[PDB]
Amino acid sequence: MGDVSKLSSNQVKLLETAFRDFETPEGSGRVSTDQIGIILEVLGIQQTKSTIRQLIDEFDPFGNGDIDFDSFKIIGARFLGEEVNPEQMQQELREAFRLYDKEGNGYISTDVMREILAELDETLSSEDLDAMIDEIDADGSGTVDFEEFMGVMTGGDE
């Protein structure tokens, strides 16, 4: 809960960038607790100073005035949770290629693309599948991978 290893370097970038931005009283190497309530706003996590007093009371019990990156990192790690990925349970077809890749190319051949269509749309006859195959592979690369599959499965029929 909080942790430091729970933080991906992506998030630490934002942390580190804002850390140094409001950092230091006169060259301390840490970021002032008066700035913590600011950065927590810059990072869109914690609340105004009333809440920040908890943070300071917790991470700076020593009354130093400013907290090091590790202390701030724990702060970030417990509040950030900026993990809102667009490929979350979406465009899964990428990893599903190897799932359906009987042939072993990393890309699914037009043969496997056929059987995939038939499964989802059992209205496509064997010949229809072949035409779909033609229609699917937009790049004419021969194997269905990139915009072929993303365009046939997640293309937007309507």
Side-chain angles (χ1 to χ4, degrees), residues 112-150:
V112 48
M113 177 81 281
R114 271 178 184 163
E115 60 180 279
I116 294 181
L117 311 158
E119 173 60 58
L120 280 299
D121 280 281
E122 47 175 285
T123 53
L124 279 291
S125 303
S126 55
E127 299 293 88
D128 289 86
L129 295 175
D130 177 71
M132 270 201 167
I133 292 307
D134 188 64
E135 192 168 275
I136 290 163
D137 175 17
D139 189 86
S141 197
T143 49
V144 181
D145 177 76
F146 29 113
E147 301 198 284
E148 310 80 68
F149 201 100
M150 309 315 308

PDB file of all heavy atoms in Angstrom, residues 112-150:
ATOM      1  N   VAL A 112      -5.839 -18.717 -40.853  1.00  0.00           N
ATOM      2  CA  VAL A 112      -6.356 -18.603 -39.494  1.00  0.00           C
ATOM      3  C   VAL A 112      -7.363 -17.454 -39.392  1.00  0.00           C
ATOM      4  O   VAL A 112      -8.348 -17.545 -38.666  1.00  0.00           O
ATOM      5  CB  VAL A 112      -5.221 -18.418 -38.456  1.00  0.00           C
ATOM      6  CG1 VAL A 112      -4.255 -17.358 -38.905  1.00  0.00           C
ATOM      7  CG2 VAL A 112      -5.786 -18.086 -37.086  1.00  0.00           C
ATOM      8  N   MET A 113      -7.129 -16.382 -40.135  1.00  0.00           N
ATOM      9  CA  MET A 113      -8.073 -15.272 -40.171  1.00  0.00           C
ATOM     10  C   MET A 113      -9.448 -15.771 -40.618  1.00  0.00           C
ATOM     11  O   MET A 113     -10.470 -15.367 -40.074  1.00  0.00           O
ATOM     12  CB  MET A 113      -7.561 -14.175 -41.105  1.00  0.00           C
ATOM     13  CG  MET A 113      -8.498 -12.985 -41.268  1.00  0.00           C
ATOM     14  SD  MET A 113      -8.403 -11.795 -39.913  1.00  0.00           S
ATOM     15  CE  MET A 113      -9.392 -12.585 -38.648  1.00  0.00           C
ATOM     16  N   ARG A 114      -9.449 -16.677 -41.598  1.00  0.00           N
ATOM     17  CA  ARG A 114     -10.672 -17.321 -42.078  1.00  0.00           C
ATOM     18  C   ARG A 114     -11.464 -17.947 -40.935  1.00  0.00           C
ATOM     19  O   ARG A 114     -12.634 -17.624 -40.726  1.00  0.00           O
ATOM     20  CB  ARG A 114     -10.321 -18.415 -43.085  1.00  0.00           C
ATOM     21  CG  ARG A 114     -10.239 -17.962 -44.524  1.00  0.00           C
ATOM     22  CD  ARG A 114      -9.831 -19.109 -45.439  1.00  0.00           C
ATOM     23  NE  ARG A 114      -9.653 -18.680 -46.828  1.00  0.00           N
ATOM     24  CZ  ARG A 114      -9.001 -19.396 -47.749  1.00  0.00           C
ATOM     25  NH1 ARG A 114      -8.438 -20.554 -47.426  1.00  0.00           N
ATOM     26  NH2 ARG A 114      -8.904 -18.953 -48.996  1.00  0.00           N
ATOM     27  N   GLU A 115     -10.814 -18.840 -40.200  1.00  0.00           N
ATOM     28  CA  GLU A 115     -11.480 -19.582 -39.130  1.00  0.00           C
ATOM     29  C   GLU A 115     -11.925 -18.653 -37.997  1.00  0.00           C
ATOM     30  O   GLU A 115     -12.932 -18.914 -37.333  1.00  0.00           O
ATOM     31  CB  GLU A 115     -10.579 -20.705 -38.595  1.00  0.00           C
ATOM     32  CG  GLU A 115      -9.257 -20.229 -38.017  1.00  0.00           C
ATOM     33  CD  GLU A 115      -8.393 -21.363 -37.504  1.00  0.00           C
ATOM     34  OE1 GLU A 115      -8.630 -21.830 -36.373  1.00  0.00           O
ATOM     35  OE2 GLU A 115      -7.463 -21.789 -38.220  1.00  0.00           O
ATOM     36  N   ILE A 116     -11.185 -17.568 -37.789  1.00  0.00           N
ATOM     37  CA  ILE A 116     -11.552 -16.571 -36.785  1.00  0.00           C
ATOM     38  C   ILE A 116     -12.884 -15.913 -37.137  1.00  0.00           C
ATOM     39  O   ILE A 116     -13.773 -15.799 -36.290  1.00  0.00           O
ATOM     40  CB  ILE A 116     -10.462 -15.485 -36.643  1.00  0.00           C
ATOM     41  CG1 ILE A 116      -9.182 -16.096 -36.072  1.00  0.00           C
ATOM     42  CG2 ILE A 116     -10.939 -14.338 -35.765  1.00  0.00           C
ATOM     43  CD1 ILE A 116      -8.062 -15.099 -35.871  1.00  0.00           C
ATOM     44  N   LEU A 117     -13.014 -15.496 -38.392  1.00  0.00           N
ATOM     45  CA  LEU A 117     -14.241 -14.861 -38.871  1.00  0.00           C
ATOM     46  C   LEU A 117     -15.417 -15.791 -38.682  1.00  0.00           C
ATOM     47  O   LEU A 117     -16.405 -15.435 -38.055  1.00  0.00           O
ATOM     48  CB  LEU A 117     -14.129 -14.538 -40.351  1.00  0.00           C
ATOM     49  CG  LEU A 117     -12.861 -13.828 -40.763  1.00  0.00           C
ATOM     50  CD1 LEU A 117     -12.627 -14.050 -42.242  1.00  0.00           C
ATOM     51  CD2 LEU A 117     -12.962 -12.350 -40.432  1.00  0.00           C
ATOM     52  N   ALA A 118     -15.286 -16.987 -39.248  1.00  0.00           N
ATOM     53  CA  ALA A 118     -16.315 -18.022 -39.160  1.00  0.00           C
ATOM     54  C   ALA A 118     -16.799 -18.242 -37.726  1.00  0.00           C
ATOM     55  O   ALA A 118     -17.980 -18.490 -37.496  1.00  0.00           O
ATOM     56  CB  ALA A 118     -15.782 -19.329 -39.722  1.00  0.00           C
ATOM     57  N   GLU A 119     -15.880 -18.168 -36.771  1.00  0.00           N
ATOM     58  CA  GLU A 119     -16.218 -18.353 -35.364  1.00  0.00           C
ATOM     59  C   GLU A 119     -17.138 -17.234 -34.876  1.00  0.00           C
ATOM     60  O   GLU A 119     -18.239 -17.489 -34.388  1.00  0.00           O
ATOM     61  CB  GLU A 119     -14.937 -18.410 -34.526  1.00  0.00           C
ATOM     62  CG  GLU A 119     -15.169 -18.442 -33.024  1.00  0.00           C
ATOM     63  CD  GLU A 119     -15.981 -19.640 -32.566  1.00  0.00           C
ATOM     64  OE1 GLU A 119     -15.557 -20.787 -32.818  1.00  0.00           O
ATOM     65  OE2 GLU A 119     -17.029 -19.439 -31.922  1.00  0.00           O
ATOM     66  N   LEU A 120     -16.690 -15.995 -35.024  1.00  0.00           N
ATOM     67  CA  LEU A 120     -17.468 -14.841 -34.590  1.00  0.00           C
ATOM     68  C   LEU A 120     -18.733 -14.683 -35.427  1.00  0.00           C
ATOM     69  O   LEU A 120     -19.820 -14.450 -34.899  1.00  0.00           O
ATOM     70  CB  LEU A 120     -16.619 -13.567 -34.676  1.00  0.00           C
ATOM     71  CG  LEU A 120     -15.634 -13.338 -33.526  1.00  0.00           C
ATOM     72  CD1 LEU A 120     -16.373 -13.207 -32.205  1.00  0.00           C
ATOM     73  CD2 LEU A 120     -14.605 -14.450 -33.448  1.00  0.00           C
ATOM     74  N   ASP A 121     -18.582 -14.826 -36.732  1.00  0.00           N
ATOM     75  CA  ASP A 121     -19.685 -14.671 -37.659  1.00  0.00           C
ATOM     76  C   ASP A 121     -19.916 -15.959 -38.432  1.00  0.00           C
ATOM     77  O   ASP A 121     -19.383 -16.145 -39.525  1.00  0.00           O
ATOM     78  CB  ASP A 121     -19.410 -13.513 -38.621  1.00  0.00           C
ATOM     79  CG  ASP A 121     -19.714 -12.166 -37.996  1.00  0.00           C
ATOM     80  OD1 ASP A 121     -20.904 -11.787 -37.942  1.00  0.00           O
ATOM     81  OD2 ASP A 121     -18.770 -11.487 -37.545  1.00  0.00           O
ATOM     82  N   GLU A 122     -20.733 -16.841 -37.867  1.00  0.00           N
ATOM     83  CA  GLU A 122     -21.047 -18.120 -38.481  1.00  0.00           C
ATOM     84  C   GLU A 122     -22.036 -17.962 -39.635  1.00  0.00           C
ATOM     85  O   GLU A 122     -22.756 -18.897 -39.995  1.00  0.00           O
ATOM     86  CB  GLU A 122     -21.618 -19.055 -37.431  1.00  0.00           C
ATOM     87  CG  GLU A 122     -22.690 -18.417 -36.569  1.00  0.00           C
ATOM     88  CD  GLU A 122     -23.320 -19.408 -35.615  1.00  0.00           C
ATOM     89  OE1 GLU A 122     -24.121 -20.248 -36.070  1.00  0.00           O
ATOM     90  OE2 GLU A 122     -23.019 -19.352 -34.408  1.00  0.00           O
ATOM     91  N   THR A 123     -22.079 -16.772 -40.192  1.00  0.00           N
ATOM     92  CA  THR A 123     -22.930 -16.477 -41.321  1.00  0.00           C
ATOM     93  C   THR A 123     -22.089 -16.447 -42.587  1.00  0.00           C
ATOM     94  O   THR A 123     -22.600 -16.461 -43.709  1.00  0.00           O
ATOM     95  CB  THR A 123     -23.623 -15.128 -41.097  1.00  0.00           C
ATOM     96  OG1 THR A 123     -22.636 -14.131 -40.810  1.00  0.00           O
ATOM     97  CG2 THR A 123     -24.596 -15.226 -39.935  1.00  0.00           C
ATOM     98  N   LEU A 124     -20.785 -16.407 -42.375  1.00  0.00           N
ATOM     99  CA  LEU A 124     -19.815 -16.417 -43.449  1.00  0.00           C
ATOM    100  C   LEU A 124     -19.515 -17.843 -43.877  1.00  0.00           C
ATOM    101  O   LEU A 124     -18.987 -18.637 -43.099  1.00  0.00           O
ATOM    102  CB  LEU A 124     -18.521 -15.730 -42.989  1.00  0.00           C
ATOM    103  CG  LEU A 124     -18.519 -14.200 -43.031  1.00  0.00           C
ATOM    104  CD1 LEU A 124     -18.545 -13.730 -44.470  1.00  0.00           C
ATOM    105  CD2 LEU A 124     -19.696 -13.616 -42.268  1.00  0.00           C
ATOM    106  N   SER A 125     -19.863 -18.166 -45.108  1.00  0.00           N
ATOM    107  CA  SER A 125     -19.551 -19.474 -45.657  1.00  0.00           C
ATOM    108  C   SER A 125     -18.073 -19.529 -46.049  1.00  0.00           C
ATOM    109  O   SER A 125     -17.388 -18.508 -46.009  1.00  0.00           O
ATOM    110  CB  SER A 125     -20.447 -19.770 -46.858  1.00  0.00           C
ATOM    111  OG  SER A 125     -21.821 -19.696 -46.501  1.00  0.00           O
ATOM    112  N   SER A 126     -17.583 -20.705 -46.420  1.00  0.00           N
ATOM    113  CA  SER A 126     -16.157 -20.884 -46.692  1.00  0.00           C
ATOM    114  C   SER A 126     -15.663 -19.914 -47.775  1.00  0.00           C
ATOM    115  O   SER A 126     -14.608 -19.291 -47.629  1.00  0.00           O
ATOM    116  CB  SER A 126     -15.881 -22.336 -47.088  1.00  0.00           C
ATOM    117  OG  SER A 126     -16.686 -22.733 -48.186  1.00  0.00           O
ATOM    118  N   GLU A 127     -16.446 -19.762 -48.837  1.00  0.00           N
ATOM    119  CA  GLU A 127     -16.101 -18.842 -49.918  1.00  0.00           C
ATOM    120  C   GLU A 127     -16.197 -17.393 -49.445  1.00  0.00           C
ATOM    121  O   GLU A 127     -15.354 -16.560 -49.787  1.00  0.00           O
ATOM    122  CB  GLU A 127     -17.023 -19.064 -51.119  1.00  0.00           C
ATOM    123  CG  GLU A 127     -16.939 -20.462 -51.710  1.00  0.00           C
ATOM    124  CD  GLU A 127     -15.602 -20.743 -52.362  1.00  0.00           C
ATOM    125  OE1 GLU A 127     -14.673 -21.191 -51.665  1.00  0.00           O
ATOM    126  OE2 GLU A 127     -15.475 -20.517 -53.585  1.00  0.00           O
ATOM    127  N   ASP A 128     -17.222 -17.102 -48.652  1.00  0.00           N
ATOM    128  CA  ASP A 128     -17.401 -15.773 -48.074  1.00  0.00           C
ATOM    129  C   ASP A 128     -16.200 -15.399 -47.219  1.00  0.00           C
ATOM    130  O   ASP A 128     -15.717 -14.268 -47.266  1.00  0.00           O
ATOM    131  CB  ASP A 128     -18.668 -15.722 -47.227  1.00  0.00           C
ATOM    132  CG  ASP A 128     -19.936 -15.765 -48.051  1.00  0.00           C
ATOM    133  OD1 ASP A 128     -20.400 -16.875 -48.377  1.00  0.00           O
ATOM    134  OD2 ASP A 128     -20.480 -14.684 -48.365  1.00  0.00           O
ATOM    135  N   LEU A 129     -15.726 -16.365 -46.439  1.00  0.00           N
ATOM    136  CA  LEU A 129     -14.524 -16.194 -45.626  1.00  0.00           C
ATOM    137  C   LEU A 129     -13.350 -15.752 -46.487  1.00  0.00           C
ATOM    138  O   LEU A 129     -12.598 -14.862 -46.108  1.00  0.00           O
ATOM    139  CB  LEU A 129     -14.166 -17.499 -44.915  1.00  0.00           C
ATOM    140  CG  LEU A 129     -15.176 -17.982 -43.875  1.00  0.00           C
ATOM    141  CD1 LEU A 129     -14.773 -19.340 -43.328  1.00  0.00           C
ATOM    142  CD2 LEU A 129     -15.302 -16.969 -42.750  1.00  0.00           C
ATOM    143  N   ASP A 130     -13.205 -16.376 -47.650  1.00  0.00           N
ATOM    144  CA  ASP A 130     -12.104 -16.065 -48.555  1.00  0.00           C
ATOM    145  C   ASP A 130     -12.185 -14.623 -49.049  1.00  0.00           C
ATOM    146  O   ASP A 130     -11.171 -13.932 -49.148  1.00  0.00           O
ATOM    147  CB  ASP A 130     -12.100 -17.027 -49.741  1.00  0.00           C
ATOM    148  CG  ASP A 130     -11.013 -16.694 -50.736  1.00  0.00           C
ATOM    149  OD1 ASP A 130      -9.824 -16.902 -50.417  1.00  0.00           O
ATOM    150  OD2 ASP A 130     -11.339 -16.214 -51.840  1.00  0.00           O
ATOM    151  N   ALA A 131     -13.394 -14.167 -49.347  1.00  0.00           N
ATOM    152  CA  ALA A 131     -13.598 -12.788 -49.766  1.00  0.00           C
ATOM    153  C   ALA A 131     -13.329 -11.846 -48.610  1.00  0.00           C
ATOM    154  O   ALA A 131     -12.727 -10.787 -48.791  1.00  0.00           O
ATOM    155  CB  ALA A 131     -15.004 -12.574 -50.293  1.00  0.00           C
ATOM    156  N   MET A 132     -13.775 -12.234 -47.416  1.00  0.00           N
ATOM    157  CA  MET A 132     -13.458 -11.471 -46.221  1.00  0.00           C
ATOM    158  C   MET A 132     -11.959 -11.369 -46.062  1.00  0.00           C
ATOM    159  O   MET A 132     -11.439 -10.306 -45.777  1.00  0.00           O
ATOM    160  CB  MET A 132     -14.081 -12.075 -44.966  1.00  0.00           C
ATOM    161  CG  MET A 132     -15.461 -11.530 -44.660  1.00  0.00           C
ATOM    162  SD  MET A 132     -15.922 -11.757 -42.931  1.00  0.00           S
ATOM    163  CE  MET A 132     -17.354 -10.686 -42.819  1.00  0.00           C
ATOM    164  N   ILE A 133     -11.272 -12.479 -46.282  1.00  0.00           N
ATOM    165  CA  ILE A 133      -9.820 -12.508 -46.231  1.00  0.00           C
ATOM    166  C   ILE A 133      -9.218 -11.413 -47.110  1.00  0.00           C
ATOM    167  O   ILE A 133      -8.360 -10.644 -46.669  1.00  0.00           O
ATOM    168  CB  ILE A 133      -9.277 -13.880 -46.689  1.00  0.00           C
ATOM    169  CG1 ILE A 133      -9.635 -14.969 -45.675  1.00  0.00           C
ATOM    170  CG2 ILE A 133      -7.780 -13.826 -46.923  1.00  0.00           C
ATOM    171  CD1 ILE A 133      -9.218 -14.651 -44.260  1.00  0.00           C
ATOM    172  N   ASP A 134      -9.689 -11.358 -48.344  1.00  0.00           N
ATOM    173  CA  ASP A 134      -9.245 -10.357 -49.310  1.00  0.00           C
ATOM    174  C   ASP A 134      -9.516  -8.955 -48.792  1.00  0.00           C
ATOM    175  O   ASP A 134      -8.682  -8.054 -48.900  1.00  0.00           O
ATOM    176  CB  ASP A 134      -9.990 -10.550 -50.629  1.00  0.00           C
ATOM    177  CG  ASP A 134      -9.441  -9.668 -51.732  1.00  0.00           C
ATOM    178  OD1 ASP A 134      -8.266  -9.850 -52.123  1.00  0.00           O
ATOM    179  OD2 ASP A 134     -10.185  -8.792 -52.215  1.00  0.00           O
ATOM    180  N   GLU A 135     -10.697  -8.792 -48.229  1.00  0.00           N
ATOM    181  CA  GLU A 135     -11.163  -7.501 -47.740  1.00  0.00           C
ATOM    182  C   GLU A 135     -10.423  -7.081 -46.461  1.00  0.00           C
ATOM    183  O   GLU A 135     -10.159  -5.898 -46.244  1.00  0.00           O
ATOM    184  CB  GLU A 135     -12.672  -7.584 -47.497  1.00  0.00           C
ATOM    185  CG  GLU A 135     -13.337  -6.240 -47.251  1.00  0.00           C
ATOM    186  CD  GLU A 135     -14.848  -6.324 -47.300  1.00  0.00           C
ATOM    187  OE1 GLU A 135     -15.413  -6.236 -48.411  1.00  0.00           O
ATOM    188  OE2 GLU A 135     -15.476  -6.466 -46.231  1.00  0.00           O
ATOM    189  N   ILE A 136     -10.096  -8.064 -45.629  1.00  0.00           N
ATOM    190  CA  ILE A 136      -9.411  -7.833 -44.360  1.00  0.00           C
ATOM    191  C   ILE A 136      -7.997  -7.297 -44.564  1.00  0.00           C
ATOM    192  O   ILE A 136      -7.667  -6.212 -44.078  1.00  0.00           O
ATOM    193  CB  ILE A 136      -9.341  -9.140 -43.547  1.00  0.00           C
ATOM    194  CG1 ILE A 136     -10.728  -9.524 -43.054  1.00  0.00           C
ATOM    195  CG2 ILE A 136      -8.377  -9.007 -42.382  1.00  0.00           C
ATOM    196  CD1 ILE A 136     -10.836 -10.965 -42.620  1.00  0.00           C
ATOM    197  N   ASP A 137      -7.166  -8.057 -45.276  1.00  0.00           N
ATOM    198  CA  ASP A 137      -5.772  -7.675 -45.490  1.00  0.00           C
ATOM    199  C   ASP A 137      -5.698  -6.444 -46.386  1.00  0.00           C
ATOM    200  O   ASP A 137      -5.718  -6.538 -47.615  1.00  0.00           O
ATOM    201  CB  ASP A 137      -4.970  -8.843 -46.074  1.00  0.00           C
ATOM    202  CG  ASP A 137      -3.533  -8.474 -46.433  1.00  0.00           C
ATOM    203  OD1 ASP A 137      -3.031  -7.435 -45.948  1.00  0.00           O
ATOM    204  OD2 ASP A 137      -2.903  -9.225 -47.209  1.00  0.00           O
ATOM    205  N   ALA A 138      -5.636  -5.293 -45.740  1.00  0.00           N
ATOM    206  CA  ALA A 138      -5.653  -4.011 -46.418  1.00  0.00           C
ATOM    207  C   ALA A 138      -4.302  -3.673 -47.028  1.00  0.00           C
ATOM    208  O   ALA A 138      -4.229  -2.984 -48.047  1.00  0.00           O
ATOM    209  CB  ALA A 138      -6.068  -2.930 -45.436  1.00  0.00           C
ATOM    210  N   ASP A 139      -3.232  -4.165 -46.421  1.00  0.00           N
ATOM    211  CA  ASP A 139      -1.891  -3.792 -46.852  1.00  0.00           C
ATOM    212  C   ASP A 139      -1.397  -4.720 -47.952  1.00  0.00           C
ATOM    213  O   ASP A 139      -0.436  -4.419 -48.660  1.00  0.00           O
ATOM    214  CB  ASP A 139      -0.922  -3.832 -45.666  1.00  0.00           C
ATOM    215  CG  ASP A 139       0.444  -3.257 -45.996  1.00  0.00           C
ATOM    216  OD1 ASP A 139       0.611  -2.023 -45.890  1.00  0.00           O
ATOM    217  OD2 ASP A 139       1.358  -4.027 -46.361  1.00  0.00           O
ATOM    218  N   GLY A 140      -2.095  -5.839 -48.112  1.00  0.00           N
ATOM    219  CA  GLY A 140      -1.705  -6.820 -49.098  1.00  0.00           C
ATOM    220  C   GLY A 140      -0.414  -7.505 -48.709  1.00  0.00           C
ATOM    221  O   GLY A 140       0.345  -7.956 -49.568  1.00  0.00           O
ATOM    222  N   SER A 141      -0.168  -7.583 -47.407  1.00  0.00           N
ATOM    223  CA  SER A 141       1.080  -8.124 -46.898  1.00  0.00           C
ATOM    224  C   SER A 141       1.030  -9.650 -46.900  1.00  0.00           C
ATOM    225  O   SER A 141       2.063 -10.320 -46.850  1.00  0.00           O
ATOM    226  CB  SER A 141       1.338  -7.597 -45.481  1.00  0.00           C
ATOM    227  OG  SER A 141       2.697  -7.760 -45.091  1.00  0.00           O
ATOM    228  N   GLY A 142      -0.178 -10.190 -46.976  1.00  0.00           N
ATOM    229  CA  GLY A 142      -0.349 -11.630 -47.047  1.00  0.00           C
ATOM    230  C   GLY A 142      -0.734 -12.228 -45.712  1.00  0.00           C
ATOM    231  O   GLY A 142      -1.435 -13.236 -45.650  1.00  0.00           O
ATOM    232  N   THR A 143      -0.263 -11.613 -44.645  1.00  0.00           N
ATOM    233  CA  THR A 143      -0.614 -12.036 -43.307  1.00  0.00           C
ATOM    234  C   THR A 143      -1.412 -10.948 -42.618  1.00  0.00           C
ATOM    235  O   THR A 143      -1.150  -9.763 -42.808  1.00  0.00           O
ATOM    236  CB  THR A 143       0.636 -12.365 -42.469  1.00  0.00           C
ATOM    237  OG1 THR A 143       1.591 -11.302 -42.574  1.00  0.00           O
ATOM    238  CG2 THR A 143       1.269 -13.668 -42.925  1.00  0.00           C
ATOM    239  N   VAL A 144      -2.383 -11.356 -41.826  1.00  0.00           N
ATOM    240  CA  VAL A 144      -3.228 -10.424 -41.111  1.00  0.00           C
ATOM    241  C   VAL A 144      -2.601 -10.099 -39.760  1.00  0.00           C
ATOM    242  O   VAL A 144      -2.401 -10.989 -38.934  1.00  0.00           O
ATOM    243  CB  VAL A 144      -4.639 -11.012 -40.902  1.00  0.00           C
ATOM    244  CG1 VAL A 144      -5.537 -10.023 -40.179  1.00  0.00           C
ATOM    245  CG2 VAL A 144      -5.251 -11.426 -42.236  1.00  0.00           C
ATOM    246  N   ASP A 145      -2.268  -8.837 -39.538  1.00  0.00           N
ATOM    247  CA  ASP A 145      -1.624  -8.453 -38.286  1.00  0.00           C
ATOM    248  C   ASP A 145      -2.079  -7.082 -37.816  1.00  0.00           C
ATOM    249  O   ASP A 145      -2.868  -6.962 -36.884  1.00  0.00           O
ATOM    250  CB  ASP A 145      -0.100  -8.440 -38.428  1.00  0.00           C
ATOM    251  CG  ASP A 145       0.581  -7.973 -37.154  1.00  0.00           C
ATOM    252  OD1 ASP A 145       0.660  -8.765 -36.196  1.00  0.00           O
ATOM    253  OD2 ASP A 145       1.036  -6.807 -37.095  1.00  0.00           O
ATOM    254  N   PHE A 146      -1.607  -6.053 -38.497  1.00  0.00           N
ATOM    255  CA  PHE A 146      -1.729  -4.701 -37.998  1.00  0.00           C
ATOM    256  C   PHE A 146      -3.120  -4.124 -38.237  1.00  0.00           C
ATOM    257  O   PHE A 146      -4.044  -4.405 -37.477  1.00  0.00           O
ATOM    258  CB  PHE A 146      -0.603  -3.789 -38.550  1.00  0.00           C
ATOM    259  CG  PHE A 146      -0.064  -4.169 -39.915  1.00  0.00           C
ATOM    260  CD1 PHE A 146      -0.260  -3.345 -41.010  1.00  0.00           C
ATOM    261  CD2 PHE A 146       0.647  -5.350 -40.098  1.00  0.00           C
ATOM    262  CE1 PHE A 146       0.231  -3.692 -42.259  1.00  0.00           C
ATOM    263  CE2 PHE A 146       1.136  -5.704 -41.341  1.00  0.00           C
ATOM    264  CZ  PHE A 146       0.927  -4.876 -42.425  1.00  0.00           C
ATOM    265  N   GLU A 147      -3.304  -3.357 -39.292  1.00  0.00           N
ATOM    266  CA  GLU A 147      -4.572  -2.668 -39.479  1.00  0.00           C
ATOM    267  C   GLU A 147      -5.601  -3.588 -40.119  1.00  0.00           C
ATOM    268  O   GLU A 147      -6.790  -3.280 -40.160  1.00  0.00           O
ATOM    269  CB  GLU A 147      -4.378  -1.395 -40.288  1.00  0.00           C
ATOM    270  CG  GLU A 147      -3.409  -0.431 -39.624  1.00  0.00           C
ATOM    271  CD  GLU A 147      -3.523   0.980 -40.148  1.00  0.00           C
ATOM    272  OE1 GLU A 147      -3.044   1.247 -41.266  1.00  0.00           O
ATOM    273  OE2 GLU A 147      -4.091   1.836 -39.431  1.00  0.00           O
ATOM    274  N   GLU A 148      -5.129  -4.723 -40.608  1.00  0.00           N
ATOM    275  CA  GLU A 148      -5.986  -5.762 -41.138  1.00  0.00           C
ATOM    276  C   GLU A 148      -6.920  -6.297 -40.060  1.00  0.00           C
ATOM    277  O   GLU A 148      -8.139  -6.232 -40.190  1.00  0.00           O
ATOM    278  CB  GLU A 148      -5.145  -6.887 -41.701  1.00  0.00           C
ATOM    279  CG  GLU A 148      -4.081  -6.384 -42.643  1.00  0.00           C
ATOM    280  CD  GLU A 148      -2.883  -5.834 -41.910  1.00  0.00           C
ATOM    281  OE1 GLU A 148      -2.158  -6.626 -41.275  1.00  0.00           O
ATOM    282  OE2 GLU A 148      -2.703  -4.602 -41.922  1.00  0.00           O
ATOM    283  N   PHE A 149      -6.333  -6.806 -38.980  1.00  0.00           N
ATOM    284  CA  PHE A 149      -7.108  -7.415 -37.911  1.00  0.00           C
ATOM    285  C   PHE A 149      -7.824  -6.349 -37.091  1.00  0.00           C
ATOM    286  O   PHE A 149      -9.016  -6.472 -36.807  1.00  0.00           O
ATOM    287  CB  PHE A 149      -6.208  -8.250 -37.008  1.00  0.00           C
ATOM    288  CG  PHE A 149      -6.962  -9.283 -36.227  1.00  0.00           C
ATOM    289  CD1 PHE A 149      -6.982 -10.595 -36.652  1.00  0.00           C
ATOM    290  CD2 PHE A 149      -7.655  -8.944 -35.078  1.00  0.00           C
ATOM    291  CE1 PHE A 149      -7.674 -11.555 -35.946  1.00  0.00           C
ATOM    292  CE2 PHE A 149      -8.353  -9.903 -34.370  1.00  0.00           C
ATOM    293  CZ  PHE A 149      -8.360 -11.211 -34.806  1.00  0.00           C
ATOM    294  N   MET A 150      -7.099  -5.298 -36.718  1.00  0.00           N
ATOM    295  CA  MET A 150      -7.685  -4.192 -35.971  1.00  0.00           C
ATOM    296  C   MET A 150      -8.801  -3.518 -36.775  1.00  0.00           C
ATOM    297  O   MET A 150      -9.630  -2.797 -36.219  1.00  0.00           O
ATOM    298  CB  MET A 150      -6.611  -3.160 -35.608  1.00  0.00           C
ATOM    299  CG  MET A 150      -5.377  -3.752 -34.934  1.00  0.00           C
ATOM    300  SD  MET A 150      -5.772  -4.937 -33.635  1.00  0.00           S
ATOM    301  CE  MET A 150      -6.908  -3.972 -32.658  1.00  0.00           C
TER     302      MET A 150
END
